[PDB]
Amino acid sequence: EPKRGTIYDRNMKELAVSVTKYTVWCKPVEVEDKKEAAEKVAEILDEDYKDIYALISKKNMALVKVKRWIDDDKASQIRDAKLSGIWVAEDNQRYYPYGNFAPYVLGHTSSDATGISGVEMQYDKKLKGKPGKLEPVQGNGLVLSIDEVIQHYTEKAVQKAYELNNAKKVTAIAMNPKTGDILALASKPDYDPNDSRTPIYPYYQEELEKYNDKDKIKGYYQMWRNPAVSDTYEPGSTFKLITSSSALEEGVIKDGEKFTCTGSVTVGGRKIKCWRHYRPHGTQEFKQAVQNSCNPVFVELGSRLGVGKMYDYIESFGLMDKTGIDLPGEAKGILYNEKNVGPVELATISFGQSISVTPIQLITAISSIANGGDLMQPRVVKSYTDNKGNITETVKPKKVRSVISKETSKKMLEIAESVVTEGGGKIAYIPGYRLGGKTGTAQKVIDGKYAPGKYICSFVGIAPCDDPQIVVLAIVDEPTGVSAFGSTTAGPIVKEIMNDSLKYLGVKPVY
Amino acid sequence: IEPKRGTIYDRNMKELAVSVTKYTVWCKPVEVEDKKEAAEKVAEILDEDYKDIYALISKKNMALVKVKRWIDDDKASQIRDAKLSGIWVAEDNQRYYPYGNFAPYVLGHTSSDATGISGVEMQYDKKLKGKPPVQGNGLVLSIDEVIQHYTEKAVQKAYELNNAKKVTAIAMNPKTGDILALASKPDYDPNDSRTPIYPYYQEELEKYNDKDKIKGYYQMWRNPAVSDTYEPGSTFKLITSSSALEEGVIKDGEKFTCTGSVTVGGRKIKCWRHYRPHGTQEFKQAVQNSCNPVFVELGSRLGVGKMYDYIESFGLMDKTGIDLPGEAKGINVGPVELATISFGQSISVTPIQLITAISSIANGGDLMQPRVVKSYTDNKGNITETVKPKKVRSVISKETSKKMLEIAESVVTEGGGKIAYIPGYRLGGKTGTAQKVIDGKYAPGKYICSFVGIAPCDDPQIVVLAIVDEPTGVSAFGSTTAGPIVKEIMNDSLKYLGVKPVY
Ligand SMILES: *C(=O)[C@@H](NC(=O)[C@H](N)c1ccccc1)[C@@H]1N[C@@H](C(=O)O)C(C)(C)S1
Ligand SMILES: *C(=O)[C@@H](NC(=O)[C@H](N)c1ccccc1)[C@@H]1N[C@@H](C(=O)O)C(C)(C)S1
Ligand SMILES: [Zn+2]
Ligand SMILES: [Zn+2]
């Protein structure tokens, strides 16, 4: 079996490496004195007698693995023990040196070192070594766009929010909007790629004993599923950045136009309420309606666009199609067919309800607003290496299309900054770093229906808005026992990741 | 009449800088006998505000007033044909750069009185100036406009891709010391030398009060390739290696062992790749893997004495004497400084010093004076004199030169330079990554990445130094940032130079 190629972060830190280890094997029948062998092996390996005894006493199993991937020192003690029916064999370990880290990027391999999830699978052929015969050649390596420092800050912020919000799931993606490079992708609960079948979060512990042995592979695939690329969700008010960009690009907002909030608008015989319908926003300039997250104003902009223009921009921002991200099992969101869209559906779409997207779709779309209107193909793999760590080839950023003009982009970045300085994203304000973004709080869809007390809260951030270098999307899925708002659950995630990442990146503060 | 300057040509006699005859409208106010009637006519012809023209011709206290500068020949004979007593037109030559925003750090530009204030325009101001009208003598640059276009294109692409503070590339003919190309982004347009054409310069000029704007101008105009110093990083291992081999301190088939670190006194210098040490290495392989411990050992075997002699001999302590203005001269810790110096840290050079040093390795060991001016012409475009290639000294033997060219090729075929590999073209070179020295202190997340290429290594015809200064949002390594710049320039330039592929 040949070693797989090494997977590096963008600073050439090893994230996944094939290392030559030794495994302790046993044929029970060939073991003369089982208590004696168990005690010798147990002492060498530093394991409890009763556990090693239970392994080498096994019935009807002709060949038993006693312990995988022991170091050379302990493997030499086993050999030199000269025990019967007990031996050591060379065994390639697929080792992930940062452990419970970036599992939904890296993925993992089966027993035979075949990639079965994440980058390990997507680039299985590129990573595979060339076999030897009774010497093997290590496979070519990969350099990710992922930065282990930003990934750490992302994992840390997401793990904190998961505990604090007692959430079903917390997910964050950090993107370079200029290139579409993923800097970080974290979701909790997650798994350790060093031990892909051992749940390390109670949630997955409880989910794996709702399956019999025959069907446990289904529970494993559930735990290995990348929520950033495979799950869909109604994005809430973050989609108001899409509606705003579309409205400004189409010229449907007059300069100095005042929009009046009375707390509701009637469409299709239904009242669509402002969140603050008890205390109407009254007269608003457009900037102030985004700051206020005033639903009726977005209903009006949706109507001025109509179903056709609205669906053109949704398609153009990439929200009806896979992003083409180089990870396995991407979904493509859920949207009502354009020609069956009624007035109430159109009105809700205008503020991000009755449309489902992946997190990757939504961050990719928002990144085009932060990149002069250019939609980029997201990617995780930036470069290929030989088996000695030498770069052989690097991948160019791919511009898919211009969604909006440079002028609309600049106006939107000025509006996004004002949401964080003057509006509903104030919680995420960092002095000197010109953070912009938008919050969402959306009732959760389960089996095509809106369930009660179950929300998805999100915040998308862009920094710095004068020259965007990082976009962060954080999603808190079903926060429990807390103020369930985008600002209070997800805003602190984006603020922490932005604060730590911009200082790591050396972004100069401007006060 | 300030006479026409000499024309500046590329080496294929394409015009890069030429004086063109325009016309200026003059007034002697005490002879405009019918002022606002005379100023109504001139206002239309020149299309002026009817007031701005009157205001100028009705000046009580001036013997001569310039009405409008650099007007076209139609309007010149229109003004002559109106035969007003106090108003005429005179010739007035304008400097034009037909390629516009192209090799601005080589060409430079002039002030309104046709005096050169940067680049070749200033360095050769005397040679270019006309007789007071006889047009001045012209220059033929070593610059090739085709290779310059390949260099500008590669450097602009890298500037955008890497969101860098700056990208700089020099192409040199190692046999002659001739500069084939010198480009840097951001740069400026010598046709309009005070209007920033890059956001970066738009920002840096707005930081000065209008009164103090000159420090801003001279910052936009500064040629980073001759005036800016930097820490070369591992490209310096080509100097250290050449020096080691020339002194003979490397034994034939000697093996060097990497275990992630060395001990050069109590202080232990570690390798850059101590996570997976390189193990046992032929010298070739130490250079391919850029193994720091090996170059420390080589440094120790030379001593401070011989190291500093070789550095000086390669010209790295002295100006090159390139014929451009404002060249930087450039910038204690015992065996520890000696150790770090061995791979290009705590040592600062200009890009022109470094490419000149590497060029001597690629030219059988002959250090050459670099030059941008190959020939002089008359005022009619005939060549009168060619500047001879000037050897400064032999730094190493043809033997050491051949060994170093074999190693340089192996860096690109087998080692850290693989990104730049072109089938048939025998490229060699070395990557560098350094932390940026600012006012003497290393920063955080601030790297200068570089790649020096030599091709073909069996008969070198071109050396290219590419430097990406502060790449942003991307992996900061010589190979990924600077390697594609050299590859692109080498690919386009070797075909144009008519280098035959050998498979
Ligand atoms: C966008 O997400 C909007 N959300 C809604 O209108 C929901 N139907 C809602 C959920 C919870 C409470 C009230 C309404 C606006 N943006 C939200 C946010 O920015 O957090 C909001 C709650 C301010 S309303
Ligand atoms: C030569 O430039 C060396 N560079 C360094 O030792 C820097 N201190 C460094 C920068 C980034 C990461 C680790 C160390 C060696 N040559 C470089 C190159 O060829 O680009 C290198 C990164 C392989 S280390
Ligand atoms: Zn409202
Ligand atoms: Zn080493």
Numbering used by the authors:
A (entry chain A): 56 to 189, 209 to 585
B (entry chain B): 55 to 186, 210 to 408, 414 to 585
The article reads:
Cephalosporins are members of the β-lactam family of antibiotics. These drugs achieve their bactericidal potency by irreversibly inhibiting penicillin-binding proteins (PBPs), particularly the transpeptidase (TPase) PBPs that cross-link cell wall peptidoglycan. Four annotated TPase PBPs exist in the genome of C. difficile R20291, a hypervirulent epidemic ribotype 027 strain: PBP1 (CDR20291_0712), PBP2 (CDR20291_0985), PBP3 (CDR20291_1067), and SpoVD (CDR20291_2544). A recent study found PBP1 and PBP2 are essential for vegetative growth in R20291, while SpoVD and PBP3 are essential for sporogenesis. Remarkably, in addition to C. difficile PBP2, we find this Zn2+-binding motif is also present in C. difficile PBP3 and SpoVD, meaning three of the four TPase PBPs, and all three class B PBPs in C. difficile have this motif.
Next, we determined the structures of PBP3 and SpoVD, at 2.40 Å and 2.20 Å resolution. Both SpoVD and PBP3 possess a canonical class B PBP fold that closely resembles Pseudomonas aeruginosa and E. coli PBP329,30. Like PBP2, the four residues in the Zn2+-binding motif of C. difficile PBP3 and SpoVD consist of an invariant His, a Cys from the X residue of the SXN motif, and two electron rich residues—in this case Cys instead of Asp. Importantly, we find Zn2+ binds in an almost identical manner as PBP2, suggesting Asp and Cys are interchangeable at the first and second position. The significance of the Asp → Cys substitution between SpoVD/PBP3 and PBP2 is unclear. Whereas the redox-sensitive cysteine in the SXN motif for PBP2 can potentially function as a sensor for environmental oxygen levels, the replacement of Asp for Cys in both sporulation specific PBPs (PBP3 and SpoVD) may further enhance the sensitivity and/or subject them to additional regulation. Nonetheless, SpoVD and PBP3 are very promising drug targets.
